[PDB]
C-alpha cells in the first residue's frame, strides 16, 4: 500500500479546496447585461461602477454582484447566448426615443420564448425619458405612424404620474411599457417575470432597484417551491 | 458584373451535380442486405465522477486510456484517473466561460479556450510541482470553439469568426489561416495521418482542408441546418456528421457523395456529439433529450440506448483500445460505460 | 443544398399593387417558419412580416399593417406577399427568409453578417 | 462583392475537375474493413470479467 | 394470556401502515447522494421519527399478549413517548427553516445554514431523549408517592408538562405562518395588478388543520382526565395522533418533484 494511501490522500486535499472555493461563490449573484448603441448602456455601466467580455463588481449591504458585458463578438447571437442559462437575471436597456423599437421588441420576444432561457427573469430599463418629453411636445408623432393602435389608447388607472408632468408624455411612456408587458404576460409559464422601470440618463438609484428585483426573484422562487404561490 | 459570375457559378454547380450523379450506380444499404444484424447492445455504468459544481461542457481522453481531462463552467479544469476515481489534478482558470479542452498526445501539456478569444496552454511536467500557464495565443476575433494538438509545438483552432488557424506555440504566432466558411465553425477532426482535417460550420456545410498547402479541396452539403459534430471513420476514408435537423449522415471522400442517413420519426431533437467504435461498426450519438443512441453503421438500424443523465448530454468519447465509453452532461457528472 | 428564389417586383406607380413569390427547395417546407424582410437604399435590413408552420399565426409591422397580406402553400412549397396601395417609401430590395431550426418558436434572422438561409432578393421601385 | 464572386468562381473551377469512383467500390471497401477487424472490438464482443480493467 | 379486543388489532394495523410508509420514504431519501440539502435532512429526521413510532406500536400488542412480560412494556412506552416528542420537534424545525429561507433569501446558501441545521437537529433529539426517560425512572407508579395518569405506567405531571410544551409549539407555528402569509399577500397583489389565492389557502388549511385536529383531543384529555375514566376514552383519543404520522409524509415528502420523478422511474 505504498503506491496507495498516498494517491488516496492527495485526492482528499484537492477535494477540500474545491469545497472551500465553492463556498465563496454561493454568496455572489451574476447578471447579464444587454443593450444597443443608441441605448445609454455605457452611462449605466459607469454609474454602477479588444476582449471578448468585460466584468464589473459592486457590493450592496454586504452582498456581492458581478455584471458581465459582451465585447468583441459578431452580429449573430444564437450560439453563444446558451452560455447564460443559470444567471440570476438579465438587464435589458431600451432607448425609448429605422424602426428600432420594433427590432428591440423582436429581440425581447426571441429571448422570452427560447428554450434554455425560459426560467430567467428580466429587469427592463427604459432609458432617455427627457428626449421623449422634448420630442412629443414638438409635433413629432413617430408613434402615430409606426404604431397605429396608439390612436386608440388611454392612460391606465394604476398610473402614478410625477408632479408637473404632462399627460402626453405619460401616455407615451405607458404605451411603450404595455408593449413589452403584452409579450411578457402572453406565453409565460409561471416560472419567470418582468420588472420594468423608467430610467433617466444619469441616475443614482438603479443599484437599489437591482437589489430589490433580485430579492423578489428569489423570494418568488422559494414561495413557488412550498406550493404557496 | 454580378449577373455573369452568378450564371457561371450556376453552370459550374450544374456540371458538378451531373458529374456526381453519373457515379451513383448502387446504394450502400443494398450491398449490405445479406449481413447479419449485430443484435442487442446492453451496457452498464461502472463509475461516476463527482466534484464539479456547474455544468461540464467538454472532455477528452488520453492516449494511455486511463487518464482524462474535463472542463466546467465554475472555472475548473480537472484531471481524473478512471480506474480508481482519484483526482490527479485540479487547475483554476482565469476565465469562467470555457468551451473546449484538449490533452496532448504525449501527456505533458493541456489547452483550453472560450468566450475570451484566447487559447491557453498549461505545462504539466512542472519540475517544481506546480501547474502554471505556459502560453497564451491571442489572434482570433471570435470565441474559440475547438482545438486539437498535432504535436508538442503545433496546434489547430477553429473560431466563431468563420475561420480556422494553425499556430506555432514556440513563437506564439500564426502559421496558416483557413478561410472559406460563411458561418461559425463548430467542430473539427484530425485524420489518423494528420495531413488533412475536416470542418463543419453553421451554414449546413463541411469542408476538407490540407494542412501543408493551406487550401480547400472538397465541400460537402446535404444537411438542412447547423452542423454540431464531426469525426472520421477509423481508416480515414469517410466521416460522419450530426445536425440540428435531428439526423446523422455518413459522407465518403473518394466517391464525393453521401452514403447513409440515420434518423427516426420519434426523434425531434438536435444532436450534440458523435463517435465511432474501434472496428467502425457501431456509431454512438448524444441528444438534447438526455439520452444516447447506438446505431448499426452498416445498416442504419438502432441497436441500443444509454439513459443515465438528468440534463442535456454535452460530450462523448471512446478510448483508443475501445473498452470504455465516457459521457458528460449539464448535470455536473461524468459516467463511464462498459459492456458485460 | 438550401435554395430560395424570389420572383416579381419591378417599377410601379403610387396606389399600385404587386405580388411577390418565393420558391424554396432543399428542405422539408412544412416544418419551418417563414418571413419577409426588406432593405432600403442607404439603410439597414428591416423585418416586414412572418407566418408560422401551418398559417394560423400571422404578424405584421406597424407601418404596413392593413395593406400587405402574406400566405403560404405547403403542397407546392411557395410563399406569397400581396402588396396593395404602394407609396414611394416602399422602394427597396425584398428578401424571403427562413428560421434556423425546425419545431421551434423563435428566430434570429435579420443580421447583416451574411445570414445563410435567405435569398438574393427582388427590387421594387415606386415612382411617377 | 465582385471579388467574392471571382473567388467563388475560381474555387468552383478548382473543385470541378477532380476524379471520382463508383459508389459500389467504396461500399465494398468500407464493408471489407468493417469485417476484417470484427474479432477485436470489445464493445461489439465483450471480454470476460477477468480481463476487464473496470470490473 | 389475556384476550385482546378490536382496538389492539386496529392499533397494530395503523402501526404497520405507518411503518411501511415511513420506511419507503426513508429508503428513497437515503439512497441518493443528491438529497443532502438541509430541508431534506429535516424531512428525513421527521420520517425516521415517524418510522420509530410506527414500529413502536408493534412492540406493545405482541409483548403483553404474546410473550407475557412487564419490563418490555415500560421500555416500549418510553420509546413511543420519545418518538412522538421528536416528531413534534421536527415539525417546528421545518417551519422555522421555511421562515428563515424567506427572511434571509438573498444570503441563504452558505455554511451558516448548515451549522443552524446541525444545531436544530441536536436540540430536537436532545429534548426528545430528555422527555423520554421519565417513564423508566423517577416517574413510575406502584409506590404511593405519585398519582397514575391516563396511561398506565406514567405519572400525572409528565402529561401536564408535555401538554404545556405542545401548546407553546402551536403558538410559535401560528406566529411564523402569519408572517409568511403577509409576504405571500404582497407578492400576489403585485403579480395580479399587471393582468397576470387558492393554493395558499388550501395548503395552509391542510398544514395548520391536520396538526390541531389530530392532536388537541388527547392534549385536552390529559388535563381533564384521570385514572378512573374507562380506557375507551384513551383508545378513541389516541387514533388521530397515529393518523397524523400517515398524513405527514404525503404533505411534506411525496409532493416534491424530484421524489416523484425517482418514484416514477423506479416503480414504473
Ligand atoms: C417548546 C418551546 C420551549 C420551544 C421554544 C423554541 C423557541 C425558543 C425558538 C423556536 C423558534 C425560534 C424563533 C424562530 C425565528 C426567529 C426569527 C429570528 O429573526 C432573525 O433572524 C433576526 C435575528 C438574527 O438574524 O440574528 C430571530 C429569532 C427567532 C425569533 C427565533 C427565536 C427562538 C425561537 C422562538
Ligand atoms: C414537544 C412537545 C410535546 C409533545 C407531546 C407529545 C405527547 C406524547 C405522550 C404520550 C405518547 C403516548 C403514550 C401511549 C402509548 C400507547 C399505550 C397504549 O396503547 O395503551
Ligand atoms: C422536541 C423539543 C422541541 C425543540 C425545538 C428545537 C427547534 C428550535 C429552533 C430554534 C432556532 C435555532 C436557530 C435560530 C436562528 C437565529 O436565531 O437566527
Residue numbers in the entry:
A (entry chain A): 13 to 61, 204 to 251, 263 to 394
B (entry chain B): 3 to 342
C (entry chain N): 1 to 128
D (entry chain G): 8 to 62
E (entry chain R): 37 to 232, 242 to 313
Publication passage describing the model:
G-protein-coupled receptor 3 (GPR3) was an orphan receptor of class A G-protein-coupled receptors (GPCRs), and it is closely related to GPR6 and GPR12, all of which have a high level of constitutive Gs coupling activity. Here, by combining structural approach (including cryo-electron microscopy), mass spectrometry analysis, and functional studies, we identify oleic acid (OA) as an endogenous ligand of GPR3. Beyond its involvement in the nervous system, GPR3 is also associated with energy consumption and obesity. Functional studies demonstrate that OA triggers downstream Gs signaling, whereas lysophospholipids fail to activate the receptor.
Using cryo-EM single particle analysis, we solved the GPR3/Gs complex at a global resolution of 2.79 Å by the gold standard of Fourier Shell Correlation (FSC) = 0.143 criterion. The receptor side has a high-quality electron density map allowing unambiguous assignment of almost the whole receptor except the first 36 N-terminal residues, residues 232–240 of the intracellular loop 3 (ICL3) and residues after 311 at the C-terminus due to their high flexibility. The overall structure of GPR3/Gs complex resembles most GPCR/G-protein complexes in which the G-protein engages the receptor intracellularly via its Gα subunit. Notably, the orthosteric ligand-binding pocket is widely open on the extracellular side with a slim worm-like unknown electron density visible from the top view. Additionally, two distinct lipid densities are present at the intracellular half of the transmembrane domain on a groove formed by transmembrane helices (TMs) 4, 3, and 5. The ligand-binding pocket is formed by the extracellular side of TMs 2, 3, 5, 6 and 7. The hydrophobic residues L932.57, V187ECL2, L2837.39, L1163.32, F2636.51, F1203.36, W2606.48, A1173.33, L1955.40, L1985.43, I1243.40 and F2025.47 (superscripts refer to the Ballesteros-Weinstein numbering) form a hydrophobic tunnel which penetrates the receptor from the extracellular side to the middle of lipid bilayer on the TM4, TM5 side at an angle of 45°. Specifically, hydrophobic residues L1163.32, A1173.33, F1203.36, L1985.43, T1213.37 and A2015.46 make close contacts with the acyl chain of OA. The top of the pocket exhibits slight hydrophilicity, with two polar residues, Y2807.36 and H962.60, situated at the extracellular entry of the pocket, facing the carboxyl group of OA. We also observed densities of two water molecules on the entry of the pocket, which connect Y2807.36 and H962.60 to the carboxyl group of OA.
